[PDB]
Symmetry: C3
Subunit: 296 residues, 3 copies
């Protein structure tokens, strides 16, 4: 039995097809069983239509054995492109083994595994091409766009394995395949999926800033395009045309890294923002606000 054939077969029982159907449309994605109680992780694109139109869409989970079971949305995070479903009272679930994405290295051989019974399902193979790679993701429909620190791989990521797991050579989940490919790292998945299970919602920091990327010999980074009124950046002293070069402890190369670095800040705590303003370096102090004040 082939080296990858063994790994793909070892995780197949833990990967599921996620099907949302109305009486006029129907889409399919993949997900991974992450808890014996019936919790399933996918990406926010796979469920986007059912989450946004729950009156007309019904979501089911199809297992490796062919069983079809109703599924309910536990919670979703368009900002990290993650979501959690729940199947109730399903016995003998084969829960996937979650790895540690902090131990993943460039060159590691990986499999991007889609649901074995999906219509256009795929299983692809490659290596890890980059780590902590900020990548912009387009929201599927009415979902807002976002940027994530992704694991980059030259394994093909497509409709046939979107939402399925990125698997290392120990048959462990190291990532969730997004919609030259990218995956949400499993350690960030664990944090997001746990809070979506405790709270049904994730609260992310916000500053009230929109940026555009700039790269030149003076000052490269994320140039402040807009500051919202009454925003944390508004009170912290951030001004337009400022070129943000550092957010907290993370240097910011462009707008993509800016979005990701902001989400690493602590809500309600002072934090430094370094900018280049009219050719002058300036450090500012900002207290991020929660993006969802009622859930915080």
């Amino acid at each position: 039995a082939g080296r990858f054939t063994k790994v793909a077969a070892a995780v197949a029982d833990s990967v599921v097809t996620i099907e949302s159907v109305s009486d006029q449309e129907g889409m399919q994605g993949s997900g991974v069983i992450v808890d014996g109680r019936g919790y399933i992780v996918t990406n926010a694109h796979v469920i986007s239509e059912a989450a946004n139109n729950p009156s007309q869409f019904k979501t089911t989970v199809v297992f490796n054995d062919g069983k079809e079971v109703p599924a309910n949305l536990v919670g979703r995070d368009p900002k990290t492109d993650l979501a959690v479903l729940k199947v109730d009272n399903v016995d003998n679930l084969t829960v996937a083994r979650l790895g540690d994405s902090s131990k993943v290295r460039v060159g590691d051989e990986v499999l991007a595994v889609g649901a074995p019974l999906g219509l256009r399902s795929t299983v692809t193979q490659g290596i890890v091409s980059a780590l902590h790679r900020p990548v912009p993701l387009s929201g599927e429909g009415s979902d807002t766009d976002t940027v994530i620190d992704a694991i980059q791989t030259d394994a093909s990521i497509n409709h046939g394995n979107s939402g399925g797991p990125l698997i290392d050579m120990d048959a462990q989940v190291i990532g969730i395949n997004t919609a030259l490919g990218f995956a949400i790292p499993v350690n960030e998945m664990k944090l997001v999926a746990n809070s979506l299970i405790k709270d049904g919602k994730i609260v992310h920091p916000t500053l009230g800033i929109s940026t555009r990327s700039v790269s030149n010999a003076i000052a490269s980074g994320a140039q402040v395009a807009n500051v919202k009124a009454g925003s944390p950046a508004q009170k912290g002293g951030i001004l337009e045309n400022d070129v943000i070069v550092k957010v907290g402890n993370r240097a910011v190369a462009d707008s993509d890294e800016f979005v990701v670095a902001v989400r690493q800040l602590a809500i309600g705590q002072d934090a430094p923002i370094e900018v280049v303003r009219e050719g002058r370096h300036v450090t500012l102090t900002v207290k991020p606000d929660p993006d969802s004040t009622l859930e915080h």
Copy 2:
């Protein structure tokens, strides 16, 4: 010597360049030697121009040793994208070893091998991404479009290895590369190539139906778009707007699977077709006709 280098070198003598030339045009593809008498298998796209315009096109086979030899069309099957050529009285041919595509599993490492002396020739590597995957194929010019149960692979399939073999790690042919890539499985190739050698033609079942894919919460499958007059479906009771969900022993997910499932039926024998008609499940009995009545 590399693991894949050994396999690619082991099959090179069995892979040939197929060149068809007129006095104003010329194209190249790949093929594989499948019988010591000089029979060579390629896909129907590679020869399409010479088969359709034999008065102006001449076809030759170029071997690994550089020998160039005239080739004649034994037969072709646009419906399975397969074709057989013949070289006459060529000695010491290195016949390829044909595998068993029913033993191929998802994750198996494969090589998509093009003719070593072809102009744009390639050899690519990947894994098997899916099995029994219905894929639509566009006829090259005046050839009719078709759908086949393919082996899907993330090994690149391109002009440089089209018509060449898909090779497993035992240096065995498990498929024929088509024109994210697909290959005709070798077991289906054997059946088609044998009949093209006995009969010079393949006879496929037909029902007289055109379908369009549908996917919703009521009834997903292949919706009947048209029924030909006097067709087997016409006498079997199939009506327009019927959503076919099963053909024989094979469930039908969409139009792609419908085309493939029909070709698995027995000519002249009764067979069940399950449909959803105005929200009502109905089973029908159809006797498929041969698509080529004179060869049958």
Copy 3:
């Protein structure tokens, strides 16, 4: 540690980020340390803007350890898409180990390694798909287009690893990644980089011919589209509409191979050119001129 993880980690210290910046723009590529004195090889596309606009662009080299150092252009060859930079008085450089591209075989596993600290950096994996493959390359801006005998690979070649090394399983450089991917072979790199270091310039043969590819049953090859006045082909007897089929000791399949074969000729020495002229085979004798008369 993974098989490819070890190789990628072993060469990382020898791969550098190459950053050219003006006060309004900035681009990044990869390069490889090839000599302890501080010589770095990249492709001509990576530096194209700084080489063409040196008054406004500044080039730096970023090492694996994060050190940033000024770099100076030693020389470039748009015709082979190669270039050499120099860092001065940098100690403890990890020089890459240069392989022998003549020992590379089809199917060899390779890594296309980009600079570890580059913004969009990638490391991709594949096999060698073809050897001595003439490929046309578009000049980046005002640089002239060219054709090279490349190593073809199904490892992804992109902006994130352009200019970085193509690495074999012995952690040796066998090629330079260009801008389904292609790399300049290391043996041709050695010749070009050495002359760019001795002379600051490379001198290539020229005949004064422009060709277009032709492929038919009469005569396939590179059809002479234009002959420059006073050119070596002009004095050698080459005429328009001639279909060149051999240049020196190398048969010419199309215009791509013609460009490459011409560059293999000896400057100032008689050489045969075989053509098909009005359906008649004709051999001609041409004495190539240097493309840069003052440097020759």
